[PDB]
């Protein structure tokens, strides 16, 4: 997260880290056995880390639980990035507490201008590389589909939305993928892609979760 702030320990209790010997993506806990992330975060052997603040130190609230299933959307397109969503089943159920909690799925899509909370352990620099120990947070608005298509001609599908600031300085960045965009208490987005980080005229692009609620619920219930 570029241009954000330190969230504070366990203030975003639905945020998880996906670990393959190191943090490589985020995710969002949606019930005690299931996480939502990005399809481009698929790896075999994922370990989900819950209750984290400092991802480099064991601090006392962590639960480390292997993925038992990592299910990429059946229509994910790895060239257009359409349908960039994955569901991860936990091999055992997480213990829910004040620091490990689920986030609600949306009942309707959000409108342009809605302010949301984006979080992750990704790079904090727009030119160079700095990865944080603790979780970072950013408040940013959803942008109109027209502005998103103007920023990225020919690239925005009905399953994507832009969020951020056209002047630059505030964005998701490498290591944030798969993590949450939460608006009024609902998981509306998944960190997906952009063009650089926090550059002028290049807002972040997010998977539009409200289009997938039926698929999420049925896939979870079938697995």
């Amino acid at each position: 997260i570029v241009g954000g702030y330190t969230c504070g320990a366990n203030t975003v209790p639905y945020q998880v880290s996906l670990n393959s010997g190191y943090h490589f993506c985020g995710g969002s806990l949606i019930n005690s056995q299931w996480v939502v992330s990005a399809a481009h975060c698929y790896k075999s052997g994922i370990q989900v880390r819950l209750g984290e603040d400092n991802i480099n130190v064991v601090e006392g609230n962590e639960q480390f639980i292997s993925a038992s299933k990592s299910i990429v959307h059946p229509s994910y397109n790895s060239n257009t990035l359409n349908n960039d969503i994955m569901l991860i089943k936990l091999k055992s159920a997480a213990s829910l507490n004040s620091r490990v909690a689920s986030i609600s799925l949306p009942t309707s899509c959000a409108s342009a201008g809605t302010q949301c909370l984006i979080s992750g352990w990704g790079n904090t620099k727009s030119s160079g590389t700095s990865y944080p120990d603790v979780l970072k947070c950013l408040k940013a608005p959803i942008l109109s589909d027209s502005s998103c298509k103007s920023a990225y001609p020919g690239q925005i599908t009905s399953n994507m939305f832009c969020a951020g600031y056209l002047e630059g300085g505030k964005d998701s960045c490498q290591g944030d993928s798969g993590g949450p965009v939460v608006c009024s208490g609902k998981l509306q987005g998944i960190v997906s892609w952009g063009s650089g980080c926090a550059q002028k005229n290049k807002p972040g692009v997010y998977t539009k979760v409200c289009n997938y609620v039926s698929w999420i619920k049925q896939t979870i219930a079938s697995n």
Binding site: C25, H40, Q174, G175, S177, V191, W193
Partner: protein, 57 residues
């Protein structure tokens, strides 16, 4: 053009996935951050795979 001589490509996706690329200026396979999508060919999952494909380019 030899794909082993192209600079490493993070791409547009926002993951922080460690991959290997052949660095011809150093004569070594080296690590870099891949964002998870739209990989170019100088992008390997292990040093051994990189060395096999690109060593000596």
């Amino acid at each position: 053009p030899d794909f082993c001589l192209e600079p490493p490509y993070t791409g547009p996706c926002a993951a922080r996935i460690i991959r290997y690329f052949y660095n011809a200026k150093a004569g070594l396979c080296q690590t870099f951050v891949y964002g998870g999508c739209r990989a170019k060919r100088n992008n390997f999952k292990s040093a051994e795979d990189c060395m096999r494909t690109c060593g000596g380019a």
